[PDB]
């Protein structure tokens, strides 16, 4: 089997991407944030504290003939940005782009933090990291990909995120028309539960590539590219007027600047992030100061290849017995 679904930016900055997911019988379609940096599929629901719902589409398990309450089970998650949610657990039939999983754990939110309430476009998350990070208690549950894996033609999914445009998540096959040149594959560590890999270095603009190992995670649920302070300083040093602002919370630059590209290494291959991808617009409405899309990971504890990086590539998440990541230009 295979699946193929279009993913769409939630706003003009590509802050996140949403993908329609069918849940239950008859189908209830919710727009979920596919997150390769977490492993819970959770949704706004009929159980979500009413004051914490503001425009989201909710899952109503009592209207689904295939919903089943997982007795006694609970879940509770916190994300890198400090956001959080929690609730109880159903299983139900879940389909993504034509690919159906029966008995998928669908985690129903009782509580969500303010950032989720305030984002009316995101109806929940669909985690695609390894199932060892799943937060269901007392018994951890499997991700959609994990459940689907044995049915798939090939044990893979791919992320093809667009720059200010829709893209695609495919399950079970590699679309050889979706990228240029070849896919370079690189080793993954699952020790922390993430799609963790080691980049072979970087270049700033037309500069010579610096060969240096950069451990980090491929994370579709993070907006920006977070890298060591050394790397990030070398980048913004090439932008006239750029500076790190503690009050704003990172590197800012004059909106009139022409940003250099940023290259990261995948083995002997190279992915080039165009300068425009690194512009996240005015720091506040009407400001001539703009926020940078490459920021320091110091204090996160890990480097994060978020959407800024991933959308410059066609990315293969290979969930074979020994997982790997593939990157191609496109």
From Swiss-Prot:
The keyword Protease applies. It catalyses: Hydrolysis of proteins with specificity similar to that of pepsin A, prefers hydrophobic residues at P1 and P1', but does not cleave 14-Ala-|-Leu-15 in the B chain of insulin or Z-Glu-Tyr. Clots milk. Residues 17-328 form the Peptidase A1 domain. GO terms for molecular function: aspartic-type endopeptidase activity. GO terms for biological process: proteolysis. Its EC number is 3.4.23.22. Keywords: Aspartyl protease, Disulfide bond, Hydrolase, Protease, Signal, Zymogen. The active site is at residues 35, 199. It is an enzyme of class 3 (hydrolase). Disulfide bonds join 255-290. Belongs to the peptidase A1 family. This is Endothiapepsin. The lineage of its organism: Eukaryota, Fungi, Dikarya, Ascomycota, Pezizomycotina. The chain holds residues 90 to 419 of 419 of the full protein.
